[PDB]
Design a protein around this nucleic acid. Structure first.
Lengths: 144, 60, 134, 185
RNA sequence: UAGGAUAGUGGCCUACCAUGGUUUCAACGGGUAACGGGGAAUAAGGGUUCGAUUCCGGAGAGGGAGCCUGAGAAACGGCUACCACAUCCAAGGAAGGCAGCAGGCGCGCAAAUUACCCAAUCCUAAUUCAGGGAGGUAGUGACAAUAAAUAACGAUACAGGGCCCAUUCGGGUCUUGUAAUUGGAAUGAGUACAAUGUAAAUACCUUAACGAGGAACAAUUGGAGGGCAAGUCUGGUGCCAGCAGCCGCGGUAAUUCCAGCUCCAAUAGCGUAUAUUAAAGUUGUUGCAGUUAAAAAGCUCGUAGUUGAACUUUGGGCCCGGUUGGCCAACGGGGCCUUUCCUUCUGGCCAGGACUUUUACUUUGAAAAAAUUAGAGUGUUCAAAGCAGGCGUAUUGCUCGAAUAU
């Protein structure tokens, strides 16, 4: 039969066996250990709002020799310090210290995205005015 | 592990690109009519059959 | 306005609400959306039953126009139309005055202010009139 | 605390977004039948998929199953009535056939192109959506109206709305009123 | 066992007595970023994830507890007390409970009006009338879902492509289009008489009078190395700035950055983040793998667990009712006979007695809430929907429905 019971009264072995073997899945483990609510600097939420402390220049390791312009952000709902990338040609001229930004992930679900060491999140909205519209010059960053 | 790259050259190429203006062009239609504009452009009077078909050639 | 048409479909006699009730199919070719007054006139001179006992409602026109279907009632008297119709249609036809009051919440606030007063309150009114000596 | 109002999606975008064959075949449909979207083809593909799965569900039973007889005859008569399914082909293995062009042929747009009266599928589409042609006395301005058998002999212009009489029309009215101003009084 | 208590059974509680009760078939404890179900998403089959939320059931009114009234409450738009908040005060005292409707603060990625009204649906009362933030109407509303504007048709013009013909000029008609000249028609987007709509309106469906020529009434979002449809065009930058889900671009001719032109894909939508489903035969019952890629316990014994050899009325013969399809076979069904209980008496499948191996499996059926799914009918103008509707003598009326399946 090669490895599993087959008889009609053997559904308990099959249930408990698959229930034991499910723990080797990465997704099932991280969904049933609650990684999202305890670890993973958000609450497991999608976006999170936080306040810029300082501006960083992260050197890209190995290839893509460049200085990726990042910021260090303290989250409002946690107090967790978090490095977040500020994407586009410019845009570190639009973020300033003690503003509020809205961070989203990188679509890599953790796992700092490209050639950037450790930066898991990107900046979406600074001062509520939406970095894409700030970089395409269709919106104006406010006063304070 | 390196965290203090200098931020001075940020926004370099975006700020030193030479600014050009968009050219005023006649309006291309929208919706159904535009698909009709694509349709004759591809199937009815397909012009360049250089090998097979090129939707966007250069100055060939 | 072209001699248009009235049709009454699905007619039921209701002797226990004292009326005829029917669907009104109105062909009005080359004319938008005839009226309600003129439909009551043209049904009162078809049922021969005194327009203030004729009621119409419903009446949304067809897509494209030229036709509109609604509902109609014809009572055996105006005296029974004044006892079986709702008051809003009897306002529409001019058969009861639109009895205006104050607002909803103004009535509710006046009710709540009456809830705090026990009795007629004229004793309380004169007693707080007596308050102005201390 | 009401009753919910149900709805449904009527289309399904395909799984591979960029296949050159499917884009060529769908622009061919959109140019032969004068469509706006690819959603106007995905809707027809949704209709085909639902009809065709229902037909397979009947084909997997035995013949003279009462559900097979009832639902097969009903689905066949509904496909025959709109003229999608032909008259000789009437036995539920022909509705597993019956491609997308058979539904896309029976729209009001293409049928208005066919019965004279429009001289183009784009002129048919604009004619329909601009408060022209009627079926009964009902003006239809839906180019996906999907005419029946017993209604395709009634596609004609409106009794309102010129090309059916009843007035010149506002650009004709204004061009007359500016013809009646400069030359005369 | 007896009592008490209760509306009543009951360790529910008390007295006396006994030592039982659950558990590897997972008790007990822990966690739940857990109210349960009808259902939702995903579409080979099997599954996998979700269900605070329109219906059903439960629970709670800041946390606990106690109680009055009543048929019904351990009620909080009732009371009493304690704790945590919190309001007025003439400082003595008083009053509190928005997880009802609207609104505010806070919280956060995250969510609307301190509007109109009982006209509809229904409920309450002493009741045809009163009341109802239940509920309906409207404002906000790109949460999703339906339909589908942003143009159509000419003619002329050079240019083809076809061809009658070619000794050798070209065009002339069947026209496909590239046209920076041009032409009259057509419509709703809006606005607006009126009418309808409505409790009163707004909107829709109707419709006078206005309202299309590009300065409009002007479609966006993402992309063009591969994956993956679509440039090796031009200028800028020079491992910088930046792009890039992944692989990779950028170090002077960058098809990948920043722009212009062109093109592509979806389109009133499109992109991004996170979660989940398919993909995933990468959780495998269907259906994985285990010599060497991850993984056969060092070895045998061994309990629960799972699994477990063959054997007992088979065959033959007669008869009867059928249901498809061309007298006929076939397909199933039933009664007899072949050594062949039918539980057995009593007097008419009843109904008193006496008893009978027990399960698993399966067919049929009951009893099965709606909504949701599947699905029948039906021209909401189509459609999503809804459960309508269709016909005549349309000045006094006829009728089919509202299936079924899971």
């Amino acid at each position: 039969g090669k490895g599993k019971p087959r008889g009609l009264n053997s559904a308990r072995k099959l249930r408990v066996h698959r229930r034991n073997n499910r723990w080797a899945e990465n997704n099932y483990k991280k969904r049933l250990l609650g990684t999202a609510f305890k670890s993973s600097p958000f609450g497991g939420s999608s976006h999170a709002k936080g306040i810029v402390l300082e501006k960083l220049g992260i050197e890209s390791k190995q290839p893509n020799s460049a200085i990726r312009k990042c910021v260090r952000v303290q989250l409002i709902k946690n107090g967790k310090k978090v490095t977040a990338f500020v994407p586009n040609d410019g845009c570190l001229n639009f973020v300033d210290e003690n503003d509020e930004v809205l961070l989203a992930g990188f679509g890599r679900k953790g796992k700092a995205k490209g050639d950037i060491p450790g930066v898991r999140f990107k900046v979406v909205k600074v001062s509520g005015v939406s970095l894409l519209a700030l970089w395409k010059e269709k919106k104006e960053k406010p006063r304070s | 592990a390196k965290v203090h790259g200098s931020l001075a050259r940020a926004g370099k190429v975006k700020s030193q690109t030479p600014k050009v203006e968009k050219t005023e062009k006649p309006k291309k239609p929208k919706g159904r009519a535009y698909k009709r504009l694509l349709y004759t452009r591809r199937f009815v009077n397909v012009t360049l059959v250089n090998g097979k078909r090129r939707m966007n050639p250069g100055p060939s | 306005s072209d001699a248009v048409t009235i049709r009454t479909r699905k007619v039921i006699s209701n002797p226990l609400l004292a009326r005829k009730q029917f669907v009104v199919d109105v062909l009005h070719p080359n004319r938008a959306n005839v009226s309600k007054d003129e439909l009551r006139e043209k049904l009162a001179e078809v049922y021969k039953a005194e327009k203030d006992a004729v009621s119409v409602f419903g009446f949304r026109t067809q897509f494209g126009g030229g036709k509109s279907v609604g509902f109609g009632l014809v009572y055996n008297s105006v005296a029974e139309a004044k006892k079986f119709e709702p008051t809003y249609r009897l306002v529409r036809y001019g058969l009861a005055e639109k009895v205006e009051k104050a607002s909803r919440q103004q009535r509710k606030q006046k009710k709540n202010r009456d809830k705090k007063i026990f009795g007629t309150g004229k004793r309380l009114a004169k007693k707080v009139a007596r308050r102005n000596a201390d | 605390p009401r009753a919910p109002r149900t709805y449904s999606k009527t289309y399904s975008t395909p799984k591979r977004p960029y296949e050159s064959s499917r884009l060529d075949a769908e622009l061919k449909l959109a140019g032969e039948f004068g469509l706006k979207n690819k959603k106007e083809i995905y809707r027809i593909s949704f209709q085909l998929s639902k009809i065709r799965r229902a037909a397979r569900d009947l084909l997997t039973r035995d013949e003279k199953d009462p559900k097979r007889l009832f639902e097969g005859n009903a689905l066949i008569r509904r496909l025959v009535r709109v003229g999608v399914l032909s008259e000789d082909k009437k036995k539920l293995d022909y509705v597993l056939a019956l491609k997308v062009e058979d539904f896309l042929e029976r729209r009001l747009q293409t049928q208005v192109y066919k019965l004279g009266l429009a001289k183009s599928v784009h002129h048919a589409r604009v004619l329909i959506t601009q408060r022209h042609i009627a079926v009964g006395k009902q003006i239809v301005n839906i180019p996906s109206f999907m005419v029946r058998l017993d209604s395709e002999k009634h596609i004609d212009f409106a009794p309102t709305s010129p090309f059916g009489g009843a007035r010149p029309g506002r650009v004709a009215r204004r061009n007359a009123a500016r013809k009646a101003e400069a030359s005369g009084e």
